[PDB]
Design a protein around this ligand. Structure first.
Ligand SMILES: NC(=O)C1=CN([C@@H]2O[C@H](COP(=O)(O)OP(=O)(O)OC[C@H]3O[C@@H](n4cnc5c(N)ncnc54)[C@H](OP(=O)(O)O)[C@@H]3O)[C@@H](O)[C@H]2O)C=CC1
Length: 212
């Protein structure tokens, strides 16, 4: 935080991550309004990563309206995190549980900046964009996104049984560069398994990318 020297701001400005699982090779991120894989350890990774903040800080999760509707009521808002829901019909309100119902990523970022990136008298550490496909494909083009946390998902059943995806991440690889595993662990603040994790007909690898 602040020091007697007067040289440091109270907190660093929060990094923005887009966290997503994408099917190889064509970056499929949805099928028929859902997702064809259900990976228990990957869902735990999402919980652990989005919840892990440096001491005295909290993280934010930013999601589209349709994804908010698919979180079970008893688990909303996602505990231990600033929840932001995007809908163009929202009225830019912060409700009785501290949930931000905002009309655009621009509007919520403007508000957070006005508040010195603080919430419930906690500074923000990381802001995670958590989906769904429409919000991912809008915000992956936003210059404020600092990194991608991509779970690379591989189908390892028979070729004919691979799920047919119908929504894909608008990810231009020329704009991004994969980092080594130590950088991923240092960013997320956790010990993360390296390599291909196995569950059923899928394997999956945790990766991090920054801008080229
Ligand atoms: N691969 C992965 O890791 C993940 C994939 N998914 C997949 O995502 C899919 C669902 O995603 P989707 O249906 O696209 O729903 P989203 O969660 O992306 O929410 C879509 C809604 O966001 C609002 N919206 C759209 N553009 C804007 C904007 N510019 N500013 C503000 N609000 C906006 C709209 O509601 P309004 O009209 O009210 O503005 C729209 O209906 C499912 O297939 C799910 O499995 C979800 C999570 C993780």
């Amino acid at each position: 935080g602040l020091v007697p020297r007067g040289s440091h701001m109270m907190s660093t400005r929060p990094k923005i991550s887009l966290i997503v699982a994408a099917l190889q090779p064509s970056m499929g991120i949805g099928a028929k309004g859902s997702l064809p894989w259900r990976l228990k350890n990957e869902m735990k990774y999402f919980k652990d990563v989005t919840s892990k903040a440096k001491d005295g800080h909290i993280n934010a999760v930013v999601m589209g309206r349709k994804t908010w509707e698919l979180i079970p009521e008893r688990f909303r808002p996602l505990a231990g995190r600033l929840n932001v829901i995007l809908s163009r019909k929202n009225d830019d309100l912060i409700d009785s549980n501290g949930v931000y119902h905002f009309s655009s990523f621009d509007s919520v970022m403007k508000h957070l900046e006005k508040d010195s990136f603080r919430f419930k008298d906690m500074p923000l550490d990381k802001i995670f964009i958590i989906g769904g496909s429409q919000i991912y494909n809008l915000l992956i083009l936003d210059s404020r996104v600092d990194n991608l946390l991509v779970t690379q998902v591989h189908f390892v059943g028979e070729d004919a049984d691979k799920p047919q995806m119908d929504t894909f991440l608008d990810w231009d690889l020329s704009k991004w560069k994969r980092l080594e595993h130590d950088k991923l662990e240092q960013y997320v603040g956790l010990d993360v398994p390296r390599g291909l994790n196995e569950e059923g007909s899928y394997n999956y690898e945790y990766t991090m990318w920054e801008k080229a």
